[PDB]
Amino acid sequence: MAKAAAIGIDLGTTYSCVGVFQHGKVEIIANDQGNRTTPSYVAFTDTERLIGDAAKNQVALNPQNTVFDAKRLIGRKFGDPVVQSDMKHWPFQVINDGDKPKVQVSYKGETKAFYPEEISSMVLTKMKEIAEAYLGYPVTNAVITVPAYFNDSQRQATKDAGVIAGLNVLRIINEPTAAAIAYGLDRTGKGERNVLIFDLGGGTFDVSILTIDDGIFEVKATAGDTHLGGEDFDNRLVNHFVEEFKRKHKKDISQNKRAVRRLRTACERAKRTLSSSTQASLEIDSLFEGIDFYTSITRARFEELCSDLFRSTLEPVEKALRDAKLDKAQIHDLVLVGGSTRIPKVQKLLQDFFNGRDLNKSINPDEAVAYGAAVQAAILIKSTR
Numbered sequence: 001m002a003k004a005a006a007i008g009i010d011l012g013t014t015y016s017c018v019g020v021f022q023h024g025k026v027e028i029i030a031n032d033q034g035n036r037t038t039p040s041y042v043a044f045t046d047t048e049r050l051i052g053d054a055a056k057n058q059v060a061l062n063p064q065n066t067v068f069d070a071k072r073l074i075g076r077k078f079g080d081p082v083v084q085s086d087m088k089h090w091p092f093q094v095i096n097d098g099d100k101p102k103v104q105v106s107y108k109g110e111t112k113a114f115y116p117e118e119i120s121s122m123v124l125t126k127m128k129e130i131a132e133a134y135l136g137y138p139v140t141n142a143v144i145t146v147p148a149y150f151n152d153s154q155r156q157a158t159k160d161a162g163v164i165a166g167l168n169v170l171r172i173i174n175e176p177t178a179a180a181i182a183y184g185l186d187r188t189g190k191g192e193r194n195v196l197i198f199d200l201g202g203g204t205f206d207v208s209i210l211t212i213d214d215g216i217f218e219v220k221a222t223a224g225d226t227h228l229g230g231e232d233f234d235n236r237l238v239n240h241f242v243e244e245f246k247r248k249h250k251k252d253i254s255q256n257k258r259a260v261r262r263l264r265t266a267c268e269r270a271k272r273t274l275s276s277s278t279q280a281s282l283e284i285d286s287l288f289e290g291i292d293f294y295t296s297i298t299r300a301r302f303e304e305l306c307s308d309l310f311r312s313t314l315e316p317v318e319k320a321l322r323d324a325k326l327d328k329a330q331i332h333d334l335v336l337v338g339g340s341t342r343i344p345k346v347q348k349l350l351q352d353f354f355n356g357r358d359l360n361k362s363i364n365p366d367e368a369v370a371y372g373a374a375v376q377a378a379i380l381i382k383s384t385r
């Protein structure tokens, strides 16, 4: 029953996803709002603790007490230059507890501080409750994914987040390995198979090269940009619409925090529409000083606005190929991961770089990692008996 059941969790920087392998198929489980992915956000309010969509929806009104990006801190020391650099950009407080970072917030009128693993355990608890509501019984066995470049300390702190959340962690697997499992790339029989995973998410970009020699996975190279993702494309749209508002009304909206946020969320939505239509419309009632902002943007203009960012994704691809000592024609499979890989220009650039090659993209790219983890969790729980 419950003891023979196992889930796969993609614990992401900005979004998390949970899957279950049953009756010969993977089911990516929808949360209580019907979304197949949940924001990795935890809000602390005057009355409650919010996790996911409800936490992300009130981020504007409560920025000091809304924690996100815990994955950027997990397993790291406070003195780490990555932690020191990131802290300058977060609206929440990060404190030092014996060279270990803690996030400090106000909760039910009291000052409370949490380790990154305690923050990640609240996200993991939500993913566990989403699976339990779908299954009708508690599931406790889980496979949790991490980036391929995570060291031993980051992997141990992720397993600890799993323990705090009440999960029996069957294994901590690499995100590009879960993605290759999702496509069944470890079941092509004998002979070394070279796979490139192109992972473009909300806030990070990762390129991984794996060799799969008879079921055995080996990471040959990792490359990328930890501060490149979908949110940079939203911000380029925001800047365009702020300048268009200035041309139409001779008014600068950039300082009005509410106007910029409403425009940002509308830009994110318009960006997603541009992945399946050649134009998208913005319909913002009373954006600034009672002025409605009813406009549109073509996919061509959007591609121009983000042109330099899209092209920059090819430098880590070349870098990973040189570190792996492989030429382009030596790569057997190209796998797309992350919601931003749905952008047609991104796909065209990667396909032209690999000389017109087909891309593995039939599995929802923001769900492929959870899909593979769910597959591995079923195999692992079956062997445990």
Ligand SMILES: Nc1ncnc2c1nc(Cl)n2[C@@H]1O[C@H](CO)[C@@H](O)[C@H]1O
Residues within 6 Å of the ligand: 015, 200, 201, 202, 203, 229, 230, 231, 268, 271, 272, 273, 275, 338, 339, 340, 341, 342, 343, 366
């Ligand atoms: N259809 C889409 N076209 C473009 N970007 C998309 C799309 N879907 C998602 Cl999710 N994203 C973005 O992926 C990230 C989450 O993985 C977010 O930045 C989201 O906007």
